[PDB]
Scaffold this active site. Structure first.
Site, PDB file in Angstrom:
ATOM      1  N   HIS A  79      47.105   2.407  -4.764  1.00 55.74           N
ATOM      2  CA  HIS A  79      47.997   1.277  -4.865  1.00 55.74           C
ATOM      3  C   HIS A  79      47.348   0.088  -4.523  1.00 55.74           C
ATOM      4  CE1 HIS A  79      48.019   2.052  -0.343  1.00 55.74           C
ATOM      5  NE2 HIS A  79      48.025   0.797  -0.140  1.00 55.74           N
ATOM      6  N   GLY A 138      46.675  -4.334   5.554  1.00 56.86           N
ATOM      7  CA  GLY A 138      45.249  -4.362   5.212  1.00 56.86           C
ATOM      8  C   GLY A 138      44.406  -3.144   5.712  1.00 56.86           C
ATOM      9  N   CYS A 197      44.931   0.008   4.785  1.00 55.52           N
ATOM     10  CA  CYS A 197      44.972   1.084   3.842  1.00 55.52           C
ATOM     11  C   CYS A 197      43.624   1.393   3.386  1.00 55.52           C
ATOM     12  CB  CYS A 197      45.828   0.492   2.723  1.00 55.52           C
ATOM     13  SG  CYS A 197      47.142  -0.758   3.103  1.00 55.52           S
TER      14      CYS A 197
HETATM   15  C1  LIG Z   1      48.451   0.400   3.700  1.00 55.28           C
HETATM   16  C2  LIG Z   1      49.730  -0.070   3.421  1.00 55.28           C
HETATM   17  O1  LIG Z   1      50.558   0.153   4.096  1.00 55.28           O
HETATM   18  N1  LIG Z   1      49.929  -0.556   1.983  1.00 55.28           N
HETATM   19  C3  LIG Z   1      51.394  -0.789   1.447  1.00 55.28           C
HETATM   20  C4  LIG Z   1      51.021  -2.017   0.489  1.00 55.28           C
HETATM   21  O2  LIG Z   1      50.270  -2.919   0.567  1.00 55.28           O
HETATM   22  C5  LIG Z   1      52.125   0.315   1.021  1.00 55.28           C
HETATM   23  C6  LIG Z   1      53.547   0.395   1.045  1.00 55.28           C
HETATM   24  C7  LIG Z   1      54.387   1.543   0.743  1.00 55.28           C
HETATM   25  C8  LIG Z   1      53.699   2.350   0.449  1.00 55.28           C
HETATM   26  C9  LIG Z   1      52.395   2.579   0.086  1.00 55.28           C
HETATM   27 CL1  LIG Z   1      51.415   4.022  -0.431  1.00 55.28          CL
HETATM   28  C10 LIG Z   1      51.448   1.382   0.590  1.00 55.28           C
END
Ligand SMILES: *CC(=O)N[C@@H](CO)c1cccc(Cl)c1
Ligand SMILES: *CC(=O)N[C@@H](CO)c1cccc(Cl)c1
Lengths: 304, 304
Positions: B41, B143, B145
């Protein structure tokens, strides 16, 4: 979101760990620049620990008696000196992995990470607080001596603790990096009283703010209190008296949540008088005091 | 002695963290050998996350659109591929700090350390368990992620988790390093049910053994139980059914303490039916399930 008992990344400290052996005793040392720091009781045998005369014991040792190994490589010791309860072994090579560092003497109630080591090798890292009575409740087995406590501000490691011993009660005692014990302790195998401990009130309040930020709000009430009234409750429950300096450091959390510090004090007062009634706060069934207001701000804002 | 929720030393993992930016999205990547792994993503904008067609979104990207920075230095991207929910960016330089590593898919109930990172920079490390419902209760802000979970066996890092998202309930979901989600989750901004969770029975028993080893014994009783009887209690309290495989892995702790596994089950049965009565075990007022039997043996024996 989410709130965990987070330790600092230990990498910068792992690079400083060495094994120090003197005679038949082996423990951990901290190699910063061209000096290795370790507990002075590395020079003792079991019989010496009952009442060691460290000055006399150290006089029988020469540089070549201190074996220092950084992983697989051997360090050459060119000097040794005792400073308080630490030995400083000057080596001929500066640690190439020496991070930017400082030696700090932390205050009771402050937190830090411990890198538990055995034989110079890191085993694990955890966060803890220096109790108001200058002990720490760590996880230390024989050979963990010399493991250090630290905080990290961006690229600077502030070393604040070196492990020396376990009291007969199972709690831990150690020194700052100048070898001065935290608390009344002496490096000797004798029963030693740790003072009456108390709960770190400012930290519990900081953690209640972290709970509100992260969604746990059931303990918020319609009440308020005063510093005086709250301190009568704090005295009854063996909590540290709250001062205006503590209210001041909670200011950012009070501003973020919109909950006045004395209003949070009234929630804490009600929790002390009534308990949790089978409920939890941030995955805990007791009032947590190992997070400072700074820890809460750092974790809630993602400081790296 | 002492028993803490200990994380692995994070140094070997810190050396692999990089920042990955694609368009206006920045997250963390893991640089092992000449490949950088990150959540796919990173190619999405906010509007894409509602229902992303990752194949179409990735087709609009070329190697030069993936900006990878390892601290202060820039990596040259010479290939990109999507594997499940992870992107693999081939770079022209092998990470000189790549530790010996493996990619493992952990089982529910197993534990691991998480190195929370932001913008490619480590902020903290904590230990957690993969819940029986394949979520983790971490500490992750926007962030975070791409932050990873891992275990370390001497010199080998087994990476088991990469962070992808926070469910509307505040719990966390992610993938193994092949990009397969743990649980039923999909990488999309849609409400998604996590299954009914349960308490990890074998871990609670392991932690009760750690408590006995470390001096907390008030919960030991004069009773015993059977697997069948204990499992009726486990069902009522939303605990995982105990199997002979779980009894088998508790064997070393049973042997060390001399407390038969079913006798420890009777203590746990009494604690479930009666609560702690205002007492604590290893500094906790609830039954802890984030320590596996292996974690208890490792910490109680000082494995480095
Ligand atoms: C790490 C995180 O929460 N990422 C956010 C986008 O910045 C996200 C939202 C919804 C689903 C996914 Cl896979 C990631
Ligand atoms: C680290 C540790 O506990 N060291 C042992 C000796 O191995 C010790 C016993 C009593 C006092 C002190 Cl300072 C250390």
């Amino acid at each position: 979101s989410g709130f965990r008992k987070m330790a600092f990344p230990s990498g910068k400290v792992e690079g400083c760990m060495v094994q120090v052996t003197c005679g038949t005793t082996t423990l951990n040392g901290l190699w910063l620049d061209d000096v290795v720091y370790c507990p002075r009781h590395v020079i003792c045998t079991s019989e010496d620990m009952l009442n060691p005369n460290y000055e006399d014991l150290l006089i029988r040792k020469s540089n070549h008696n201190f074996l220092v190994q950084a992983g697989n490589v051997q360090l050459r010791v060119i000097g040794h000196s005792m400073q308080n309860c630490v030995l400083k072994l000057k080596v001929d090579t500066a640690n190439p992995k020496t991070p930017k560092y400082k030696f700090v003497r932390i205050q009771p109630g402050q937190t830090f990470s411990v890198l538990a080591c055995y034989n110079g090798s890191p085993s694990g890292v955890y966060q803890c607080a220096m109790r108001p009575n200058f002990t720490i409740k760590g996880s230390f087995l024989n050979g963990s001596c010399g493991s250090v406590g630290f905080n990290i501000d961006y690229d600077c490691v502030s070393f604040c603790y070196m492990h020396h011993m376990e009291l007969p009660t199972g709690v831990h005692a150690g020194t700052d990096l100048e070898g001065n014990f935290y608390g009344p302790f002496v490096d000797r195998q004798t029963a030693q009283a740790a003072g009456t401990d108390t709960t770190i009130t400012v930290n519990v309040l900081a953690w209640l703010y972290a709970a509100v930020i992260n969604g746990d709000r059931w303990f918020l009430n319609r009440f308020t209190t005063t510093l005086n009234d709250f301190n009568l409750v704090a005295m009854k429950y063996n909590y540290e008296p709250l001062t205006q300096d503590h209210v001041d450091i909670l200011g950012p959390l009070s501003a973020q949540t919109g909950i006045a510090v004395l209003d949070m004090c009234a929630s804490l007062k009600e929790l002390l008088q009534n308990g949790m009634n089978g409920r939890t706060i941030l995955g805990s069934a007791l009032l947590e005091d190992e997070f400072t207001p700074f820890d809460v701000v750092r974790q809630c804002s993602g400081v790296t």
